[PDB]
UniProtKB/Swiss-Prot annotation, chain A:
Coiled-coil region list: none
Binding site for Ca(2+) 2: 83, 86, 88
Residues reported to bind Ca(2+) 1: 52, 82-83
Name under which the protein is recorded: Sonic hedgehog protein N-product
Disulfide bridge map: none
Gene label: Shh
Species whose genome carries this gene: Mus musculus
Positions contributing to Zn(2+) binding: 97, 104, 139
Membrane topology (UniProt): Lipid-anchor
Protein role: The dually lipidated sonic hedgehog protein N-product (ShhNp) is a morphogen which is essential for a variety of patterning events during development. Induces ventral cell fate in the neural tube and somites. Involved in the patterning of the anterior-posterior axis of the developing limb bud. Essential for axon guidance. Binds to the patched (PTCH1) receptor, which functions in association with smoothened (SMO), to activate the transcription of target genes. In the absence of SHH, PTCH1 represses the constitutive signaling activity of SMO.
UniProt subcellular location: Cell membrane
Effect annotated for changing residue 57 to H: Does not affect signaling activity in any of Shh signaling assays and causes no apparent defects in cholesterol-mediated autoprocessing reactions
Complex formation: Multimer.
Modifications made to the protein after synthesis: N-palmitoylation by HHAT of ShhN is required for sonic hedgehog protein N-product multimerization and full activity. It is a prerequisite for the membrane-proximal positioning and the subsequent shedding of this N-terminal peptide.
Shown segment, full-protein numbering: 40 to 189 of 437
Domain comment, as recorded: Binds calcium and zinc ions; this stabilizes the protein fold and is essential for protein-protein interactions mediated by this domain. The Cardin-Weintraub (CW) motif is required for heparan sulfate binding of the solubilized ShhNp. The N-terminal palmitoylated peptide is cleaved at the heparan sulfate-binding Cardin-Weintraub (CW) motif site. The cleavage reduced the interactions with heparan sulfate. The cleavage is enhanced by SCUBE2.
From Swiss-Prot, chain B:
One GO molecular-function entry: hedgehog family protein binding
Residues of the full protein shown: 215 to 666 of 700
Lineage: Eukaryota, Metazoa, Chordata, Craniata, Vertebrata
Protein name: Hedgehog-interacting protein
Topology within the bilayer: Peripheral membrane protein
Originating species: Homo sapiens (Human)
Cysteine disulfide links: 2-310, 179-379, 212-229, 274-349, 363-372, 367-378, 380-389, 394-404, 398-410, 412-421
């Protein structure tokens, strides 16, 4: 397994193309009926920084599959989620974080060096779009219903 | 013992800083907070028409560091007429933008706004600790000092599209013959040819820097350039040293010492002027109340000594001759520092004023359907090729000795026919 380069993303296309995570339908709030597709992820093998556990199923799957890949990769190191669904603001419009289809992740030890390989693991985990967004975190996302 | 100041111009509109371009014209360009750059003749008069005017693009404010931040002329502006400006804009509180412009090839005293070419667009969450000071080094590369913008780690750890450039110094080679990119990265750079780090980053450790003094003639032999900054966040000063003939493999460390005493501090500078012989080589820093002081290290021991300098401040300036200026607060005016011990303009400081002339470079001359790099290369826009982008390029491209002329109209010589021959 070869790590992802800084500021590199897979697939090598725009996130909201059909090849990646697909188009963006709209922001998901609570008074919006579509809020029912979002459900908490109580995986004990994942660290939530912190309603940060709410997310779509395809996201839950890909994320749960990744949680294993991490501790399988490093000794006693878990998968850490810094941001998931955004209940309001904190993001630019049309961000998949508004649809619970996106997640920002790091390792438990905050070892920025591992981040490169982490992204790769997320790619093989089946994430529809992974992106080495910055030194501080990786951004992953999936498609919807 | 004491220094004196003489007024030069009033009625200024929220000045922030002033500088020259090194082209003989001895024009003093004055940056204004709200997005204007006015010119001051060597005589002392202000032009009617602004050199630059982008008050619409720049979103400033009073208090709040937003607005026109800094501007730096290319070392060869006399030939290429290239300049670089940093400012805040918006539509996330705002954006710190760094762009390259080019003076009108018709009028040397005004820039062609169409020649805008964006290099960096830094995301900003707040309106403090922005920085944005532009400057060139003896190496020729462009430096960019950026404050931390108060972007905590948590912020950058749970937010997308954040700078990742804030709180550090950047190194960009603007002299490139490459077209696919706005600029290139020096091999000297630490993170050059890297796969895990931003090649632009030269060093980090900044927070809320004022105007950093740039000593271009360090008293050292190995150190060819040194930059001294004053932070306030606590409060201290940090300086970055640089060697010309050195290929960095790692990050240059910022020296964090504490020379100053207690109070705040607007900024500083190193006197390179001719007017004063005693002030020569001395670092000078002042605060918003006109309280100044001088700094000086030592070849041996390398200790710093602080001596008070006898005499609302908004910024400083430096003409071609090296003479420093003060900008205070249409209330706003420019002053000039003068050493009473010597004449205002000694017989040796005299200099013939060569007026700014039109760009006569080869690129500025015959370069169409593209732009000129600071090195003179004409980067063709899509649909063009050849030295100066005159050779039309079809889609699909012409085959069998086919020559493109009209929009995608190939041209097959005798014996051939078809859309692409
Ligand atoms: Na404005
Ligand atoms: Na400058
Ligand atoms: Na290097
Ligand atoms: Na030197
Ligand atoms: Zn994200």
């Amino acid at each position: 397994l070869t790590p992802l380069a800084y500021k590199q993303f897979i697939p090598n296309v725009a996130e909201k193309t059909l090849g990646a995570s697909g188009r963006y339908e709209g922001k998901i709030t609570r008074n919006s009926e579509r809020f029912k597709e979002l459900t908490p992820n109580y995986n004990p093998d994942i660290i939530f920084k912190d309603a940060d556990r709410l997310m779509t199923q395809r996201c839950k799957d890909k994320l749960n599959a990744l949680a294993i890949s991490v501790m399988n990769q490093w000794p006693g190191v878990k998968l850490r989620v810094t941001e998931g669904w955004d209940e309001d603001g904190h993001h630019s419009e049309e961000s998949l974080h508004y649809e619970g289809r996106a997640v920002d992740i790091t390792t438990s030890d905050r070892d920025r060096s591992k981040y490169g390989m982490l992204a790769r693991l997320a790619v093989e985990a089946g994430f529809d779009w992974v992106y080495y967004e910055s030194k501080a975190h990786i951004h992953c996302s999936v498609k919807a219903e | 013992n004491c220094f004196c100041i003489q007024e030069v111009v009033s009625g200024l509109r929220q000045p922030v800083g002033a500088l020259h371009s090194g082209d003989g014209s001895q024009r003093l360009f004055i940056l204004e907070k709200e997005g204007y750059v006015k010119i001051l003749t060597p005589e002392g008069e202000i032009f009617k028409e602004p050199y630059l005017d982008i008050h619409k693009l720049v979103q400033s404010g009073i208090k709040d560091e937003r607005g026109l931040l800094s501007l730096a002329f290319h070392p060869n502006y006399k030939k290429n007429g290239k300049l670089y400006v940093s400012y805040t804009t918006n539509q996330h509180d705002h954006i710190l933008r760094v762009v390259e412009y080019t003076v009108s090839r018709k009028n040397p005293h005004q820039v062609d706004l169409r020649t805008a070419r964006v290099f960096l667009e830094v995301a900003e969450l707040h309106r403090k600790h922005l920085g944005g000071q532009l400057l060139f080094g003896p190496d020729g590369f462009l430096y960019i000092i950026l404050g931390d913008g108060m972007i905590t780690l948590d912020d950058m750890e749970e937010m997308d599209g954040l700078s990742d450039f804030t709180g550090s110094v950047l190194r960009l080679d603007v002299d490139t013959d490459m077209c696919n990119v706005p600029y290139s990265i020096p091999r000297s750079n630490p993170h050059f040819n890297s796969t895990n780090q931003p090649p632009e980053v030269f060093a980090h450790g900044l927070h809320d820097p004022g105007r950093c003094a740039v000593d271009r003639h360090p008293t050292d032999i190995n150190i060819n350039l040194t930059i001294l900054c004053s932070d306030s966040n606590r409060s201290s000063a940090r300086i970055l040293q640089i060697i010309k003939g050195k290929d960095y493999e790692s990050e240059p460390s910022l020296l964090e010492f504490k020379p100053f005493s207690n109070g705040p501090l607007v900024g500083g500078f190193v006197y390179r002027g001719c007017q004063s012989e005693r002030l020569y080589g001395s670092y000078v820093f002042g605060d918003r109340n006109g309280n100044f002081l001088t700094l000086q290290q030592s070849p041996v021991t390398k200790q710093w000594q602080e001596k008070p300098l006898c005499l609302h401040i908004l910024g400083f300036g430096e003409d071609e001759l090296g003479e420093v200026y003060i900008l205070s607060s249409h209330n706003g005016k420019l002053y000039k520092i003068v050493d009473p011990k010597r004449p205002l303009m000694p017989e040796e400081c005299r200099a013939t004023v060569q007026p700014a002339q039109t760009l006569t470079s080869e690129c500025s001359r015959l370069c169409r359907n593209g732009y000129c790099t600071p090195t003179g290369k004409c980067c063709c826009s899509p649909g063009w090729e050849g030295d100066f982008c005159r050779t039309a390029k079809c889609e699909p491209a012409c085959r069998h000795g086919g020559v493109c002329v009209r929009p995608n109209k190939c041209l097959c010589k005798k014996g051939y026919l078809g859309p692409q021959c």
